[PDB]
């Protein structure tokens, strides 16, 4: 148990997913940022924990499952075991978050990252303590069927910069995006 973080990429219309995939074409540098933010731990020997819902797990290409170099945990109210390739399954975010503090995971885990999708985000962002939201603002509209909740600029602060995050507008494949980090500490 290190810090609690959500990471998402979201279109100008708040879209995160379309038919079990992302709503925009592949953005390699965006995937690379995701990978470097979720995989990097400054503590040797540790890994970060990625928590996700079941549709989010299945949205990941099989070659990238489980997400390499991270401990993967899937949320589901139904599955009897973790899905093929996964090793953790929790019935709730509280259950998962509790599971981190021991019996055996808590000397292996550094940062905890919520990587989607909508319901998991809603609950984490609401979760009382110290929270950071890493949001890639995909600076146009895309047809979507899954959405990210509006961020309350009265509870969260927008940070002007953040270590290892590029602060200028980026562009790729003709699509502009901004990496943002928001922080709350209620
Ligand atoms: N742009 C981005 O940053 C991201 C995009 N996506 C996209 O979003 C979509 C998938 O997201 P979404 O449809 O929201 O689905 P989720 O990944 O949130 O999966 C929903 C399911 O997972 C379980 N689940 C979710 N929350 C909990 C919980 N708190 N406790 C127990 N189980 C839970 C369920 O399974 P059960 O029915 O078995 O209980 C529920 O049906 C895809 O299109 C994917 O590509 C996903 C992540 C990031
Ligand atoms: C199809 O989805 C994926 C495909 C490959 C690897 C990971 C993901 C997942 C689960 C999620 C993400 C893929 O790119 C992302 N960018 C940001 N900024 N946040 C995220 N949560 C993801």
């Amino acid at each position: 148990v290190g810090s609690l973080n959500c990471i998402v990429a979201v279109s100008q219309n708040m879209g995160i997913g379309k038919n079990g995939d992302l709503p925009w074409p592949p953005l390699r540098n965006e995937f690379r940022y995701f990978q470097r933010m979720t995989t990097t731990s400054s503590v040797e020997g540790k890994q970060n924990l990625v928590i996700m819902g079941k549709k989010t797990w299945f949205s990941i290409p099989e070659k990238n499952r489980p997400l390499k170099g991270r401990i993967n945990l899937v949320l589901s109210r139904e599955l009897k075991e973790p899905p093929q390739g996964a090793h953790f399954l929790s019935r709730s975010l509280d259950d998962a978050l509790k599971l981190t503090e021991q019996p055996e995971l808590a000397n292996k885990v550094d940062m905890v990252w919520i990587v989607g999708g909508s319901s998991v985000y809603k609950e984490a962002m609401n979760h009382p303590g110290h929270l950071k939201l890493f949001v890639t603002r995909i600076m146009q509209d895309f047809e979507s069927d899954t959405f990210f909740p509006e961020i309350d600029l009265e509870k969260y602060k927008l940070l002007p910069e953040y270590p290892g995050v590029l602060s200028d507008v980026q562009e790729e494949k003709g699509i502009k995006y901004k990496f943002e980090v928001y922080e709350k500490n209620d």
Side-chain angles (χ1 to χ4, degrees):
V1 220
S3 47
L4 190 58
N5 303 282
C6 297
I7 182 160
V8 67
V10 63
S11 62
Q12 176 185 286
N13 61 308
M14 313 303 297
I16 65 169
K18 181 48 173 175
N19 278 341
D21 209 287
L22 298 189
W24 42 80
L27 294 180
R28 174 172 304 119
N29 290 339
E30 215 286 321
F31 277 11
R32 292 195 300 119
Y33 173 75
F34 172 83
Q35 188 276 154
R36 189 162 5 71
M37 299 299 286
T38 56
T39 313
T40 307
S41 167
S42 60
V43 180
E44 77 281 11
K46 292 228 222 263
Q47 287 168 268
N48 290 339
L49 177 68
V50 290
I51 292 180
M52 70 193 84
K54 194 176 81 186
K55 303 167 174 151
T56 294
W57 170 261
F58 282 106
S59 81
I60 307 166
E62 222 195 311
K63 70 178 194 200
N64 293 315
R65 294 210 305 255
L67 294 171
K68 187 64 153 36
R70 287 149 290 191
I71 293 161
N72 290 223
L73 180 160
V74 174
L75 302 189
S76 163
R77 289 192 137 74
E78 321 186 11
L79 299 176
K80 305 286 59 229
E81 53 173 37
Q84 143 154 92
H87 286 97
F88 294 93
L89 181 312
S90 298
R91 315 249 81 141
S92 75
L93 177 50
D94 291 342
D95 276 8
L97 282 188
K98 305 318 129 210
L99 181 60
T100 62
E101 355 152 333
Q102 270 181 55
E104 206 220 322
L105 259 174
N107 72 11
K108 294 179 189 56
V109 177
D110 182 15
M111 315 171 83
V112 178
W113 284 94
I114 282 40
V115 310
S118 183
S119 48
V120 194
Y121 283 139
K122 309 177 177 214
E123 192 185 356
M125 288 166 59
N126 197 59
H127 196 277
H130 183 29
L131 199 73
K132 292 186 190 148
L133 281 12
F134 292 76
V135 172
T136 300
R137 292 285 188 185
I138 305 299
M139 282 151 63
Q140 75 183 232
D141 293 13
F142 290 90
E143 224 261 85
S144 307
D145 61 23
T146 316
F147 303 92
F148 194 73
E150 336 280 345
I151 307 155
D152 195 13
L153 25 130
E154 302 298 338
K155 299 221 97 137
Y156 285 91
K157 30 253 212 136
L158 175 54
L159 316 169
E161 68 180 274
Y162 196 77
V165 183
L166 290 165
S167 55
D168 297 337
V169 168
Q170 313 287 319
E171 180 172 3
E172 171 174 33
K173 279 192 169 195
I175 308 175
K176 276 173 281 194
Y177 58 82
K178 233 308 271 175
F179 301 125
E180 290 191 323
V181 183
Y182 295 83
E183 186 168 21
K184 106 177 178 161
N185 210 207
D186 57 71

